[PDB]
């Protein structure tokens, strides 16, 4: 099933459609908007596009459900509480 | 070990998630033994016929994958067919509204992850887990018709670690959901 998931990403991304002006790298990241295939043809334009990526990254960027990080984030926040209390 | 709440190595026989306390294991072990008592109770009182008609918890079985092979072999013997000629059909229904036919076996404790099952049809969900009331496994002769372009093959693991693969299940997706989205969201079934 990991092989099937890897094949799904490869067939979704490596296609002639990737050279289209409306290609979607990710779909419905927050229910409404989607990540757009940059229209540039030079490396500099692609690098700029990465720099303008919003900091609001969610697991839906990866095709995962948005709640997959909820348990991980809560545990990390409690750990950050613990680390402070360990150095007081 | 017990004083440090460490599961003794002499007790760990069946497959267990690495992170399990002796307390959790004792509760899990008690549930497994209770189920084994009922299985032996039916076997002694009734014989093999009761063993076929009793619902089983795949989590409580020490080797759940062997039960699937046993049910596969049982149907093959009753119909004089080969194992490789039998494909597994899954029907999810309420325990009260369930009827077990010759090839049907009842399984309880199966939990769907990231999806809900409604009228034997899968839909993407924002809930972490969904408890399947009663899963019926049917072994029928293979028709080598491939898939209906709306069927996903969900892995069934033993526990949340997804380390041991028990078997696979074919489900029909609902509406116009993309089967690829099911693969990307990690939708699977857990035995416990």
From Swiss-Prot, chain B:
This is Cytoplasmic dynein 1 heavy chain 1. Cytoplasmic dynein 1 acts as a motor for the intracellular retrograde motility of vesicles and organelles along microtubules. Dynein has ATPase activity; the force-producing power stroke is thought to occur on release of ADP. Plays a role in mitotic spindle assembly and metaphase plate congression. Belongs to the dynein heavy chain family. It is found in: Cytoplasm, Cytoskeleton. Homodimer. The cytoplasmic dynein 1 complex consists of two catalytic heavy chains (HCs) and a number of non-catalytic subunits presented by intermediate chains (ICs), light intermediate chains (LICs) and light chains (LCs); the composition seems to vary in respect to the IC, LIC and LC composition. The heavy chain homodimer serves as a scaffold for the probable homodimeric assembly of the respective non-catalytic subunits. The ICs and LICs bind directly to the HC dimer and dynein LCs assemble on the IC dimer. Interacts with DYNC1LI1; DYNC1LI1 and DYNC1LI2 bind mutually exclusive to DYNC1H1. Dynein heavy chains probably consist of an N-terminal stem (which binds cargo and interacts with other dynein components), and the head or motor domain. The motor contains six tandemly-linked AAA domains in the head, which form a ring. A stalk-like structure (formed by two of the coiled coil domains) protrudes between AAA 4 and AAA 5 and terminates in a microtubule-binding site. A seventh domain may also contribute to this ring; it is not clear whether the N-terminus or the C-terminus forms this extra domain. Disulfide bonds: none annotated. It comes from Homo sapiens (Human). Signal peptide: none annotated. It is linked to Charcot-Marie-Tooth disease, axonal, type 2O: An axonal form of Charcot-Marie-Tooth disease, a disorder of the peripheral nervous system, characterized by progressive weakness and atrophy, initially of the peroneal muscles and later of the distal muscles of the arms. Charcot-Marie-Tooth disease is classified in two main groups on the basis of electrophysiologic properties and histopathology: primary peripheral demyelinating neuropathies (designated CMT1 when they are dominantly inherited) and primary peripheral axonal neuropathies (CMT2). Cortical dysplasia, complex, with other brain malformations 13: An autosomal dominant disorder characterized by global developmental delay with impaired intellectual development. Some patients show signs of peripheral neuropathy, such as abnormal gait and hyporeflexia. CDCBM13 is associated with variable neuronal migration defects resulting in cortical malformations.
